[PDB]
Design an enzyme around this catalytic site. Structure first.
Site, PDB file in Angstrom:
ATOM      1  N   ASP B  32       0.866  -1.176   0.000  1.00 23.90           N
ATOM      2  CA  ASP B  32       0.000   0.000   0.000  1.00 23.90           C
ATOM      3  C   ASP B  32       0.903   1.226   0.000  1.00 23.90           C
ATOM      4  O   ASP B  32       1.347   1.688   1.053  1.00 23.90           O
ATOM      5  CB  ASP B  32      -0.935  -0.024   1.206  1.00 23.90           C
ATOM      6  CG  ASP B  32      -1.969   1.089   1.174  1.00 23.90           C
ATOM      7  OD1 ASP B  32      -1.726   2.119   0.512  1.00 23.90           O
ATOM      8  OD2 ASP B  32      -3.029   0.930   1.817  1.00 23.90           O
ATOM      9  N   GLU B 124       0.696   1.778  13.560  1.00 23.79           N
ATOM     10  CA  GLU B 124      -0.350   1.787  12.544  1.00 23.79           C
ATOM     11  C   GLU B 124      -1.456   0.893  13.080  1.00 23.79           C
ATOM     12  O   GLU B 124      -1.554  -0.288  12.721  1.00 23.79           O
ATOM     13  CB  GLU B 124       0.187   1.328  11.188  1.00 23.79           C
ATOM     14  CG  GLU B 124      -0.748   1.628  10.046  1.00 23.79           C
ATOM     15  CD  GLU B 124      -1.536   0.399   9.617  1.00 23.79           C
ATOM     16  OE1 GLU B 124      -2.610   0.139  10.211  1.00 23.79           O
ATOM     17  OE2 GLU B 124      -1.065  -0.323   8.707  1.00 23.79           O
ATOM     18  N   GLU B 133     -10.678  -4.145  14.957  1.00 18.58           N
ATOM     19  CA  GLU B 133      -9.538  -4.865  15.525  1.00 18.58           C
ATOM     20  C   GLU B 133      -9.234  -4.406  16.946  1.00 18.58           C
ATOM     21  O   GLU B 133      -8.505  -5.097  17.657  1.00 18.58           O
ATOM     22  CB  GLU B 133      -8.254  -4.749  14.685  1.00 18.58           C
ATOM     23  CG  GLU B 133      -8.337  -5.254  13.261  1.00 18.58           C
ATOM     24  CD  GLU B 133      -7.068  -4.965  12.505  1.00 18.58           C
ATOM     25  OE1 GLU B 133      -5.987  -5.351  12.999  1.00 18.58           O
ATOM     26  OE2 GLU B 133      -7.157  -4.339  11.433  1.00 18.58           O
ATOM     27  N   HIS B 280      -5.755   0.242   1.114  1.00 15.91           N
ATOM     28  CA  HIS B 280      -6.274  -1.077   1.448  1.00 15.91           C
ATOM     29  C   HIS B 280      -7.367  -1.027   2.511  1.00 15.91           C
ATOM     30  O   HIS B 280      -7.952  -2.075   2.806  1.00 15.91           O
ATOM     31  CB  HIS B 280      -5.138  -2.000   1.899  1.00 15.91           C
ATOM     32  CG  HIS B 280      -4.603  -1.702   3.266  1.00 15.91           C
ATOM     33  ND1 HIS B 280      -3.925  -0.540   3.567  1.00 15.91           N
ATOM     34  CD2 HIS B 280      -4.610  -2.438   4.403  1.00 15.91           C
ATOM     35  CE1 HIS B 280      -3.557  -0.563   4.835  1.00 15.91           C
ATOM     36  NE2 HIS B 280      -3.959  -1.704   5.366  1.00 15.91           N
TER      37      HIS B 280
HETATM   38  N1  LIG Z   1      -1.571  -5.752  21.655  1.00 12.50           N
HETATM   39  C1  LIG Z   1      -0.612  -5.899  20.749  1.00 12.50           C
HETATM   40  N2  LIG Z   1       0.699  -6.002  21.154  1.00 12.50           N
HETATM   41  C2  LIG Z   1       1.713  -6.151  20.231  1.00 12.50           C
HETATM   42  N3  LIG Z   1       1.406  -6.210  18.887  1.00 12.50           N
HETATM   43  C3  LIG Z   1       0.119  -6.096  18.476  1.00 12.50           C
HETATM   44  C4  LIG Z   1      -0.906  -5.947  19.396  1.00 12.50           C
HETATM   45  N4  LIG Z   1      -2.068  -5.875  18.711  1.00 12.50           N
HETATM   46  C5  LIG Z   1      -1.803  -5.975  17.385  1.00 12.50           C
HETATM   47  N5  LIG Z   1      -0.451  -6.128  17.228  1.00 12.50           N
HETATM   48  C6  LIG Z   1       0.303  -6.244  15.965  1.00 12.50           C
HETATM   49  O1  LIG Z   1       0.231  -4.990  15.295  1.00 12.50           O
HETATM   50  C7  LIG Z   1       0.417  -5.164  13.900  1.00 12.50           C
HETATM   51  C8  LIG Z   1      -0.562  -4.304  13.086  1.00 12.50           C
HETATM   52  S1  LIG Z   1      -0.208  -4.299  11.296  1.00 12.50           S
HETATM   53  C9  LIG Z   1       1.091  -3.023  11.291  1.00 12.50           C
HETATM   54  C10 LIG Z   1       2.437  -3.601  10.847  1.00 12.50           C
HETATM   55  C11 LIG Z   1       3.611  -2.624  10.714  1.00 12.50           C
HETATM   56  N6  LIG Z   1       3.668  -1.688  11.829  1.00 12.50           N
HETATM   57  C12 LIG Z   1       3.558  -1.839   9.405  1.00 12.50           C
HETATM   58  O2  LIG Z   1       3.222  -0.651   9.388  1.00 12.50           O
HETATM   59  O3  LIG Z   1       3.865  -2.373   8.339  1.00 12.50           O
HETATM   60  C13 LIG Z   1       0.287  -6.664  13.646  1.00 12.50           C
HETATM   61  O4  LIG Z   1       1.550  -7.178  13.284  1.00 12.50           O
HETATM   62  C14 LIG Z   1      -0.178  -7.279  14.957  1.00 12.50           C
HETATM   63  O5  LIG Z   1       0.383  -8.560  15.168  1.00 12.50           O
END
Ligand SMILES: Nc1ncnc2c1ncn2[C@@H]1O[C@H](CSCC[C@H](N)C(=O)O)[C@@H](O)[C@H]1O
Ligand SMILES: Nc1nc(=O)n(CCOc2ccc(Br)cc2)cc1CNCC[C@H]1O[C@@H](n2cnc3c(N)ncnc32)[C@H](O)[C@@H]1O
Ligand SMILES: Nc1nc(=O)n(CCOc2ccc(Br)cc2)cc1CNCC[C@H]1O[C@@H](n2cnc3c(N)ncnc32)[C@H](O)[C@@H]1O
Ligand SMILES: Nc1ncnc2c1ncn2[C@@H]1O[C@H](CSCC[C@H](N)C(=O)O)[C@@H](O)[C@H]1O
Lengths: 342, 341, 343, 343
Positions: B32, B124, B133, B280
């Site tokens: 994206d 993010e 989520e 996305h």
């Molecule tokens: N409570 C939590 N503690 C640690 N990681 C978490 C979480 N809740 C969600 N996540 C993680 O947060 C991510 C969101 S997707 C974002 C991915 C990355 N920061 C990027 O920008 O490319 C996922 O990998 C998920 O596993």
């Protein structure tokens, strides 16, 4: 129960949530080949149902129980573990069949059924026949089957054939090569390329294909539901020896399945083969990690070993070699998480 | 025993973190370009907010945002990730020779220990309709590690809502439900299930994009300030009063969101509005079971009520009324089961 | 009491004959050139069936068919008409100098006293779907005046039916009924009337034309022989059907059209309202299913179309259709008196 | 009853059959100007309904009775003669209002009410206000109205104005000249051309038009529903003296109407004027048989006389002359059978 012992609870939660949607029942029901064939197998074998006691394992909305009622069954026990059981009960009432169909909510491994039955009907097939491990629930239900009772379907055939698909094989590397660059927004991603390749190759591909990619007549592995025990499905060892009809690079094995309803009047077949109209089971392809060159008249031999796991699925271990040359490859796949390519 | 496990069914958390363990899914977000390029711009153009600072990356995935913080001069970055992707992030940290700056911490941000407080949090955490989520609550929870005048990237989030007309989409979903109206499907009367089918199909929010000309009124804005909000801020009530610009059938409400990175050099916005290049996240439409008629000049009033649930999503209640006529629509949606059109 | 009055509500008849009293409605029928030119060809090309003969024109309107019989050499033509159009027919007879041959007799053919028996009856008694208006019964009733050797022009009528697919028409009608689904129309909950609304909108046969490619099987034909049929034969009309499906898809209903044949001594002339032929002012007629039936090419679609005559000069229609391979059935009631003119 | 004495049975049967269709009730309800203005008139005058007794004459689906309930009425008697009374009863039940709305099936001239009412509500307006003769049923209902009770609507104004429309005038002869030909398939039709012209001119034209075809400011005739008696509507004489604003040929008179809801809080108007958004009443135009030339500043004087008939409508006679020249024209029209020209 037997079910809880073999199933991780998180798998079961998602599984029965999925089957709780009317839209999912509808997609099965609108599979004309699937639904029409079950109907004809029951109706055309009416003497297997008239005045009989029936068990419907995993009845969903109840459609197959209504077919057994159309065919004259005296009493139908309809077992369903998802919340769809409440919708089936609505339909039994609204179709004025409360005297003939009783909906029993729960898992067939756990509920109490009062009497033995003359015939068990079910639709327990998953991708490659075995996914979901519902065939073990179907076989488990034979504790309620009279001696010389029947099973509809009576047998299941899983078919395997070698295929060539250069575009499918190369596509794995096109996708994985995303990681093979030194400055994605300033980051060198390339250390993860191998991990990306491995991840893609562990996924079976669910889609359909032109039958002209098949390189030999399929090999058949038959489960006879009247004779098998659910233990027989924990480790399924499928030897194969393919007599190659075409020369070329073999990239993997393709899978489909048939079931047969062997009634007193006639036998009716339901096929998910790629020579037949498409169904919601599609077909399944597992790649080798490396292609194997085979000539027409060579033999391609090995084994496909399906090892059941607690996620209601199987780990797929394939090994194959071209006998006349010694070239060999293998792969190990996770059937619980296929790639839907269609 | 943690904040996360108390508000989350185990089954949901298993599927959730398995989904994010796939490299293919990280690739999808990374590709994206609007999202990834905008985050890089927000961070590099506000390089002074990272220069020699301590950073926390909540849910770092592959690590991409931590690498941006390193490019911008951060002195130390704690990169927290609960999925098995944490192992892949550490591989990239080593291969990019940034072991002295980025420190991966495997685990849930509600459960890990950090050595020190941080100057700025990056993440993010946006899902569909912004809130899906429930990761915004993990982002807010992480403020326990934030120094008193620390910053947050993103800093604020705006949800936008607006009535739309789209007969085709309405009838596309009604048609699917009409299947359960047949009095004789292979001889079986299905019609008793017809209300349950309508209810199920219309509870699905529709994820796709659309032409802006279908909007019947200027959008209403609801703002979450991530510097001020607490994660308990669970039950979200969004009132709305639209001044209709066109006459016609109102089939539902359209939703999108913007986030702003309010840095010391400039404010950078990442928008998912339909007037902007597609992301996305697309947009989201919540359909009414029955459309409302309104004319230009009327006012359409009501409330969008979002109740967070234990499946990491929201139960959505939308009630809307044409003030001039009292025509009223009341609708329920399950943000967990979207329809991807 | 007259046979007409015993089968007809007065209110229906008054409105029916008022409609046909308008010159603009005569012009509309007359300007249908397929209809008018085909009648003239049937009569003139079989002129030996009219030369020096005695003719009865049942429901003559402005008189056009009687003028055709006079062109073919008829000795005497009794032109019977129950609407006020009879007075305009008399005007045309005088202005065309045919007072010695065309005799207008105003009244219902069931009630007038005709001066003598006739060699041949001519009429245009076909309504929508052939049977609407119940004027075929007046045509058959008039055979009390027909000599043993006599003929009828038209001589037979064929009704054709065939299954069709048309999701747009179905959605159009369903959308109208959806108004009565609203839970808050100006604050009023209308939805308890939704079933009644669907019933009402789907009771209306659809009068318009269509592309023959919507048809999913070869038509079934049902024939009425006007020389042999009796009035009472048309009080209950039972049309069985078995279609061999040529295409897969949804069957949204049955389509209807009709042909009539003028079987003369020189040649047989056909007037067709089929959708393969040039449009006429009868168009075609489609009866929708409230619930469409899915069928595969090669399946059979079977059932019955049953027409029951009613006192409003029309028929209550029941259509029951079933896909034999699956037992999926659809049952529908339609009110032929009150169609939806979609053209 | 008063109704049956003034109405031919055949007209009544057709009339109430028409209003028995949900689609026709839906047509009226979907007229947003009509339905919204009634709702505003009732709700914004809530002190004329709160804890009051109401009669709804010709309730149809019941919509106006539901608005009265929304405004706080204690009891509403909703009278309806068509089979739509059954559907209204279903809605009263499904909206949990059986304690406040009592549906009474029947004609308001023939049913019995159990008590007198504070206010009557109705929508009795037809084309150019008077068509259908339902204003008489509305006035008849005042036998149930308490002294100093109110009427909603309270007054109705009919507006008349002269218009020029050369193309509408010439169109009548284009249509009628179908009959002016010597050999339509061998038949000389010409003797009926005059009768065809007369038939077209007897039809009022229902459609809308640009306000610039109007040649003078309108003249207004007011019916005060608080004071009028049924008998006042059997012979309606509307004299006019138009002061011509434009020079040209006058081809006829255009009609529209307004009603006013004169409540304790405010007066609300529902207008069908050509300067206002279109309603399902459109406007009505009556041609003169021959156009009259007038110059700006001339006077066009005459009379429009409406005579009630037993088909629930009126015979219209219009006579007009240009005072400065003596040129005179007239026409006789049948309001029951208008020509719907709108597209
Ligand atoms: N409570 C939590 N503690 C640690 N990681 C978490 C979480 N809740 C969600 N996540 C993680 O947060 C991510 C969101 S997707 C974002 C991915 C990355 N920061 C990027 O920008 O490319 C996922 O990998 C998920 O596993
Ligand atoms: N018809 C079909 N359509 C499809 O699409 N597929 C492919 C689906 O592939 C998937 C892959 C991964 C996941 Br995760 C989910 C689906 C498969 C079938 C065949 N299956 C019929 C199921 C019915 O049997 C019920 N059922 C099951 N086990 C039970 C038990 N032990 N006791 C009682 N009822 C039990 C279950 O609730 C449902 O009603
Ligand atoms: N030719 C056609 N073309 C069309 O398009 N249609 C469509 C019909 O549409 C309609 C719309 C609304 C209503 Br309501 C009715 C019909 C129908 C026909 C066939 N109809 C010809 C009738 C002529 O025969 C007269 N007549 C009838 N019965 C008589 C009797 N018993 N004795 C004497 N004269 C009798 C009647 O006065 C008229 O002159
Ligand atoms: N004499 C009479 N007695 C009772 N109802 C009558 C009547 N004359 C006409 N009506 C009814 O009055 C209605 C006029 S149409 C108005 C319908 C409804 N009140 C609305 O505002 O939408 C028709 O339904 C008609 O059937």
């Amino acid at each position: 129960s037997v079910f809880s012992e073999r199933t991780e609870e998180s798998s079961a939660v998602q599984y029965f949530q999925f089957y709780g949607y009317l839209s999912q029942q509808q997609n099965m029901m609108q599979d004309y080949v699937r639904t029409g064939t079950y109907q004809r197998a029951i109706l055309q074998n009416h003497t297997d149902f008239k005045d009989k006691i029936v068990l419907d394992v995993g009845c969903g909305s109840g459609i197959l129980s209504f077919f057994a009622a159309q065919a004259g069954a005296r009493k139908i026990y309809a077992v369903e573990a998802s919340t769809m059981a409440q919708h089936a009960e609505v339909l039994v009432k609204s179709n004025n069949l409360t005297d003939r169909i009783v909906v029993i909510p729960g898992k067939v491994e756990e509920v109490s059924l009062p009497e033995q039955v003359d015939i068990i009907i079910s639709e327990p097939m998953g991708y490659m026949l075995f996914n979901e491990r519902m065939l073990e629930s179907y076989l488990h239900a034979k504790k309620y089957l009279k001696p010389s009772g029947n099973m509809f379907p009576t047998i299941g055939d899983v078919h395997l054939a070698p295929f060539t698909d250069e575009q499918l094989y190369m596509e794995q590397f096109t996708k994985a090569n995303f990681w093979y660059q030194p400055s994605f927004h300033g980051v060198d991603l390339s250390a993860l390329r191998g991990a990306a390749v491995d991840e893609y190759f562990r996924q079976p591909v669910v889609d359909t294909f032109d039958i002209r990619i098949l390189m030999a007549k399929s090999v058949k592995y038959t489960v006879n539901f009247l004779e098998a025990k659910e233990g027989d499905l924990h480790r399924i060892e499928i030897p194969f020896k393919f007599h190659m009809l075409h020369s070329g690079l073999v990239h993997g094995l393709a899978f489909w399945f048939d079931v047969a309803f062997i009634g007193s009047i006639m036998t009716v077949w339901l096929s998910t083969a790629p020579t037949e109209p498409l169904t919601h089971w599609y077909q399944v392809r597992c790649l080798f990690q490396s292609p194997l060159f085979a000539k027409a008249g060579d033999t391609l031999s090995g084994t496909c070993l399906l090892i059941a796991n607690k996620r209601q699925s199987y780990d797929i271990s394939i090994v194959a070699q071209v006998d006349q040359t010694g070239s060999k490859s293998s792969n190990l796949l996770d059937l619980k998480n296929p790639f839907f390519r269609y």
